[model samples]
Target: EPHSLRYNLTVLSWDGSVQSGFLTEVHLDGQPFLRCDRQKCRAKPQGQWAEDVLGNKTWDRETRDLTGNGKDLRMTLAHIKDQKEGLHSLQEIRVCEIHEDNSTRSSQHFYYDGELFLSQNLETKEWTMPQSSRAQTLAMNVRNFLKEDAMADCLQELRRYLKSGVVLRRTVPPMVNVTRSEASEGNITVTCRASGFYPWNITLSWRQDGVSLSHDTQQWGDVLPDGNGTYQTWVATRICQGEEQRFTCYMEHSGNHSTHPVPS
Candidate 1:
């Protein structure tokens, strides 16, 4: 099942570039998910959460198994020592998705920040402004402030400071798991689970006699990151008692690529 998400921006800021600190709060559907700062999850975050929440970590794991937290913390400052180029700060919004399989897709707007750092999310129909702008935007109607300062102006500059915090390029062949179960109607259901792959994409299908079979497929979206810096995906298809020899799971992400079906 697909998960629905809402983007909430709480304007929080730090005053100077000296040692900075942050307070963390995370909730799911109004339930307390977790809260923490600097170190790790403050307490045992309770929820049916995936081991991997899906983000820059997923990208790095899929591409190169890199190190580091992959968090791009851009603090837009109020002090003239560190401030915007011109004018006051502006407002913007961004939107994103948490895929059906519990994998998430954020807009660095998959995105991060700076002064009035902005992201235009066509889906969420929301815009994001830097933490520093939190004060100005709240002082007056954000809609009105935007007219004067403009989100575009801030985001244009912020983009220059931000970069793709993580790299993702699929590798590591998918390990296939093919299992079968018999049904009452002289037919069977085959479950094909592809786990431990890389990148964030995959394609699978059932083949028979050099052709694809149409056995009513149940797909689970694209590849999702595992906490272990790997990825997994799955698909199920119906089948018959006698017609098993030709069925194949054409997992394009697998190393032994091409037409190769694990025999029943």
Candidate 2:
């Protein structure tokens, strides 16, 4: 019987142009299985054992869709069951959201189990002024809170290496091949096939004679990521009447800048 847990911490700070907060979510597995925002901490869905338990504990869909409660309580409780290890399987997740100069946010998990058996690890923020000192008072400022802040910061940096930052950097451009599908009640369908584009999105289109076709006249798929830092997207235009009538697939992308080849 495998179980999962998560502890999430969100904090808002200004970095000149950042315009808001920086959140740090700590996970045991893929994630902790819950969330907390200003309105309410929403529970993110995850794996289960018997009868799909978080047990009967789940909040209203709307309640989970909160805006500003000043703090999220999602990490506080650990267990929803009362059998076997029971609440012993649970422990307090402490969190703090602060604006005390160097301190922004924090969470501490216990060193022991839900038993509160050991005096270790832990769980643990801020918002608007419910009072004059309300925003600052909301967070739990523990012993040497700044120390935990630095520890959390270091952990965040180390964690970045866990995910690849390589996928988004593309150096090559894309190439577009335009052709038409044969047969269509004497008419034919136009197409735009793309490949070798190093980046993500590109604008693709079909034109009749010279002007552009309307949205209802064509169908296009997104430029999806391909291997080697490249991209691919396939598009098709609605049926056009006859051969020699002139239909083309045009693509504008960051890679090559532009192109066109009327189908023969």
Candidate 3:
């Protein structure tokens, strides 16, 4: 059987950067099901009560198979940053089901990623500033169910910030050239070259028939400073393959943990 899955996301901004808050509680119907705020729960007495009542409930945690047709599952989240500010709210609704996995799950997971602006005034009561506006406001409202105009603005700002951050923080290290050649008759040769900003831990390996060929051949490059503040490292591997056979060279970098497969 399949079971329903839900998540709560909260975002708060302080100083300059946005800090993510915990997913307070998740529910199947009106009954409490899972909670994911264990790390900070120790600070509050109510957290202990929640723990006692819910028992080991955590986010991304799965529940046993659910039974009952047409059962309603509702996931709601409350945003109360300082308690004195009162509570803001967001929620999602889904139908419950049991699938081949023997666990309850929802077809779509609610996604909430963006800035939320908050305001308390007479005309609007609690109005959320559009995410595209540069002017700072009381609080930002961000959720999966935002209006079309609001969602578009939030997405556009998110993309802009993502690209800007990458451009500002990204650095490329020095490049190193590597080569390969056949050592025996009817043997195919393979070589790998890599360079990237570090941490500097790198791994290069050759595999054949789904197994590591470390004993066959291996070589590594020294970590070199890239004139910038970061370092660059490289490695090379050579291997032999028979006619109509396959081979693979895998390279990994530490900073980004990116894996690259060399063309055979």
Candidate 4:
């Protein structure tokens, strides 16, 4: 099942300074797709596909709407901040995920003073928070004016945005690296790191003289994002100190298998 993700982040600073006062960022599949800098007072597409599918005129319209949204969101957060002391900033994050079965999951998280203050189940309109009744009441009050269909258009737009197929079909080969460090006496820990690959489902393992060492390897359970539209993972194994030349790292990703040997 193929999965896709959309993230919308809005940060509102109470000080209303030029930089970092108000800004919004949108990501698609962990890739920057759009950004609206309040300082610039203009919203722009971060990726070409945004303007490509939406067209120039459509992008202009969308940008206008986003610009308005940023203003409203900032004002809303500012109003909330006025009544609460010790509040430095407020951040709202909305995430929508489309699963393989076409089911959509939506959530909203609220942060204040760089701490998670509240979280909301967008579909259920239920809010989670700490013991502050004032915060709980505030969260509930905030939801009252929020449109219940907040995620309706999100699903539609995500489906439309995905029509380009660039993100889904994109493939990037892994860059493999092998390094060694001294372990216990007469032993060394060799690591085979694979980084800067797309689509995450990669295979990285240590092999000694063409023989698998899967049973004696430690690895990061899942591939981690590099926050730049790529994924990375590594596997390390312990071997005799002088056996570095006998080890190789085999990596398979994006339909390519590129192997790297330990440094002599």
Candidate 5:
């Protein structure tokens, strides 16, 4: 025989971003089943089964509502079981707060009945939840917190890649010829002819004593596509003066994390 269960969930957040959704009218086979989103639900494989039976699954409605915006937000997930006789066992209620940005602020709260059973705050990027809870319960809390941090770390990693050096192809020559001439009263034009750079993210800029020269004009190199995922020679131009004292060309290679500098 198959046993079926239905659950209703309500999620609320502190950021005044509130929306309600449900995981209801669920049918469960007597065999263990994993609860998942309606569109993505599938039974857990028998070999990797963690628990005797898979329990009904649901997500925090507030989390679903705020897909982006990257703000500090709280999520409340409540699972209420409905039996034929009457509404009975309240399966679980969990609360968590996440700092949407890479900032350090975060928290978690859990309740059984109207009383607060467990509460936690992030300290030094580590969780400090009370030990009064069971090991399995604490594991769940820790898992959720770690997942949030991991996601934030991934974003930070991507941003670091964007800021790092230019990537070049293997086929390009290491040495290039550069030319300089007076372009205006306060600026000099510098150009370079180079070969071999596949996949481009390179740029040219003026700088003085390692500081960026924002006042001066700058130009980018043209990338010629090659068949072997490399690019042919190109020229980059920049305007600088003796007042600026120093200048350089910064080349970015696509998908590469190192920054390359060429002095003109």
Candidate 6:
């Protein structure tokens, strides 16, 4: 599983007036972590841990470059539409994800008047454009520039932000349950499910007669988000028809560890 960090930007303008402006909100793992605006270009960290690790100066130079690109994109939009005399707005979404293996993935997307026009997968450095966007006109320069902008430095910056260690350490305990079902043969399948966990670092395994079993275990997949700020996963194993009572599911998580035996 991977933890995600996102930058959501909204830029607004009207006929090249002084009222034009932009704002960026930074979210970590779906929670607000920072905020910045066009005028100051200074990141205001959200939580105590975030504030301690990230300072205004650390992002000053970087966010300025981000807002600078936001400003230029408005002009690019006007040029493409052939109309620069009215209200204009653009939204940019930049996402960076870090996996348990310490690898990173990043992307950037732009929306004009609420419609997606251009996007880039930073890893591949490929920019995607819609057929009606006419974005190809300025895509070359924009792509090259963004390749060196704040978007390009997301991985490094995110790694630095994670140095605080609090985000990864914070946790919510998991609940475990075991159920049994008939298998194809005379044997039975026992499934252990763990849910409502946080931090994604959990251990769920099957054991028989005090011995951990792995060779015959079936793991659904990695711990996945429940879409409500928690995670869930399951593992199953088969045994002889009358040996369910000898089996147990071992669970280890942030709070502690527990064992769940197959329900009668």
Rank list by TM-score: 6, 4, 3, 2, 1, 5
lDDT of 4 by residue, 70-106 (tens): 6766655654523443336566777777764557778
Off by over 4 Å in 1: 1-170, 214-222, 254-264
- Residue 162's lDDT within candidate 6 is 64
Q: Specify the highest-TM-score model's number.
A: 6
Clashes of each: 12, 27, 19, 0, 11, 0
**lDDT score for candidate 6 against the true structure:** 0.71
Candidate 2 per-residue lDDT over residues 1-264, each given as its tens digit: 111223433333222121123232323234444454444444454312211433423234323322221122122221112223322222233443322132344444331222222122332222212223421321222222434545753234223212223112234667677777777574666678888776566778877777887987778777787767688887787664654356666777653345475667
Which of 2 and 3 is ahead in TM-score? Answer: 3
User: Candidate 4: which pairs clash?
Assistant: none
What is the Cα-based lDDT of residue 190 in candidate 2?
65
Candidate 5: worst-modelled 10 consecutive residues by lDDT:
1-10
For 14-110, candidate 1 gives per-residue lDDT tens digits of 3433233333333332334344344444322322242234322212221121011111121222212333334332212233344434444444231
Residue pairs in clash, model 6: none
Model 1, residue 210: what's the lDDT? 68
Q: What TM-score, to 2 decimals, does candidate 4 have?
A: 0.49
Q: How well does model 4 score by local distance difference test?
A: 0.65
Model 2 residue-pair collision total = 27
For residues 54-121, could you state the per-residue lDDT of candidate 6 as single tens digits? 43443666577667756765554444333368776667888999876567889988876567778888
Query: In candidate 2, where is summed lDDT lowest over 10 consecutive residues?
Result: 73-82
Tens-digit lDDT string for candidate 3 (1-264) = 123322333433333333334334444323344444424222123323344544543212222211110011111222322323323333222223334343333322222233333322222234444445532322332232233224422223223323433113243433433345655764545565555455466665656565766753656557676545666555555544543144555555433333334443
Candidate 5 regions with alpha-carbon error over 4 angstroms: 1-34, 37-108, 113-117, 122-204, 214-216, 220-245, 249-259
Off by over 4 Å in 2: 1-169, 243-245
